[PDB]
Write a protein that binds this ligand. Structure first.
Ligand SMILES: CO[C@H]1C/C=C/c2nc(co2)-c2nc(co2)-c2nc(co2)[C@@H](C)CC(=O)CCC[C@H](O)CC(=O)O[C@@H](C[C@H](OC)[C@@H](C)CCC(=O)[C@@H](C)[C@@H](OC(C)=O)[C@H](C)/C=C/N(C)CO)[C@@H]1C
Ligand SMILES: Nc1ncnc2c1ncn2[C@@H]1O[C@H](COP(=O)(O)OP(=O)(O)OP(=O)(O)O)[C@@H](O)[C@H]1O
Ligand SMILES: [Ca+2]
Length: 357
């Protein structure tokens, strides 16, 4: 059985190729003693009072390799309960991942974990595959980074990839700030977990932000309430949609960047004029931060406004899209026709880490 590990900024998704969903989903966090050994994931969070917690992946890119090794170790031995030397392992990477980073991942998998075979695929490409397509443009938005990735005949078009370092954690941070200003202090890690929950449960993307603001200003009809751990009930109205509006208006958190509708359109415009029609008709949303109710309808509206008036526009937002990258990997790695595409330990021992390219 092959393994699929999809390492994100916020969450690890791991499991077995052929399965419908990752068996293990846990925070991409490593904790080491504050005062001198390590813990990963939920247990690191539980023992946070005695540990320094770190995220080895920053906006989709591995930046702490020693801690990343702990993530992988924990994934194999504690979460999946397998011996990595017994299983071909498919890993994922961010769009525009540096060549040296892909080489380091490869070296670690073979030399440290002794996997018999491995493969590294681009996250957004796997999401496209999970939707049954080989041509389309993916918007992948997680906890740490958002990318637009146009793909033609199975391959990403790297020149046309767009990146926004604005994603779920920034949205949680903004909601924390908003609620703190209203007099409900959310600052600590325990408090961040509460606000992340409020965000996931109550936030949504307005179809027309101005109209929605007017509605919230003139009626209680958009209000929702939420009981905090201390027993206070907080009610939110316009916070529900102001928070994810930041994706379309990055200026809400002081960023001068284009919003996700603009990055989508700009990405399509970088592509060959002769494939744009196919991209417009095959916009696939991937990742946890695309889960907001209303986001597909809003994107449809915004892309329609930017594109030629005769252009057929379609946004595809699969219900399973928290796990689309992982599912794409599960499909690819279990595919009878992919079995000759693995990099084997033998090939690695002959040629070294650069074989991965
Ligand atoms: C109809 O054809 C397909 C047959 C499916 C084979 C297969 N499917 C699986 C394992 O093998 C599998 N499905 C799951 C896990 O493993 C799975 N499904 C689910 C969850 O897990 C659902 C909840 C959601 C889904 O239904 C997913 C849709 C999948 C679609 O069939 C993929 C496809 O077109 O693959 C096809 C290939 C992909 O095409 C988009 C792609 C991976 C090909 C790319 C290349 O070969 C390089 C360009 C595939 C050939
Ligand atoms: N229902 C939801 N509504 C809004 N946000 C959600 C929802 N469910 C999950 N999220 C957010 O999705 C993010 C996690 O998604 P995902 O696993 O795709 O990211 P990742 O792979 O860890 O990060 P990245 O891809 O940025 O490196 C978190 O910010 C989480 O709060
Ligand atoms: Ca991801």
């Amino acid at each position: 059985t092959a393994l699929v590990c999809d390492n994100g900024s916020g969450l690890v998704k791991a499991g077995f190729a052929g399965d419908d969903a990752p068996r293990a989903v846990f925070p991409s966090i490593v904790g080491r003693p504050r005062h001198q050994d390590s813990y990963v994931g939920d247990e690191a969070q539980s023992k946070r009072g005695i540990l320094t917690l770190k995220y080895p992946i920053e906006h989709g890119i591995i930046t702490n390799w020693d801690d990343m090794e702990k993530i992988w170790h924990h994934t194999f031995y504690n979460e999946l309960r397998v011996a990595p030397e017994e299983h071909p392992t498919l890993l994922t990477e961010a769009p525009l991942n540096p060549k040296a980073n892909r080489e380091k991942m490869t070296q670690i998998m073979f030399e440290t974990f002794n996997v018999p075979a491995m493969y590294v695929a681009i996250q957004a490409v796997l999401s496209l595959y999970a939707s049954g397509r080989t041509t389309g443009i993916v918007l992948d938005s997680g906890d740490g980074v958002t990318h637009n990735v146009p793909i033609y005949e199975g391959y990403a078009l790297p020149h046309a990839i767009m990146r926004l370092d604005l994603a779920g954690r920034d949205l949680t941070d903004y909601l924390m700030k908003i609620l703190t200003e209203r007099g409900y202090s959310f600052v600590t890690t325990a408090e961040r977990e509460i606000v992340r929950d409020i965000k996931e449960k109550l936030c949504y993307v307005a179809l027309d932000f101005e109209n929605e603001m007017a509605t919230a200003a003139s009626s209680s009809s958009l209000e929702k309430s939420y009981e905090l751990p201390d027993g206070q009930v907080i009610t939110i109205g316009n916070e529900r949609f102001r928070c994810p509006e930041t994706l379309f208006q990055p200026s809400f958190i002081g960023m001068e960047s284009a919003g996700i509708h603009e990055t989508t359109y700009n990405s399509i415009m970088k592509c060959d004029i002769d494939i744009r029609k196919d991209l417009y008709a095959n916009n696939v949303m991937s990742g946890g931060t695309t889960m907001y109710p209303g986001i597909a309808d809003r994107m449809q509206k915004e892309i329609t406004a930017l594109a030629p008036s005769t252009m057929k526009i379609k946004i595809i937002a699969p219900p399973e899209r928290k796990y689309s990258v992982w599912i794409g990997g599960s499909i690819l790695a279990s595919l009878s026709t992919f079995q000759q595409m693995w990099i084997t330990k033998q090939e690695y021992d002959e040629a070294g880490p650069s074989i991965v390219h």
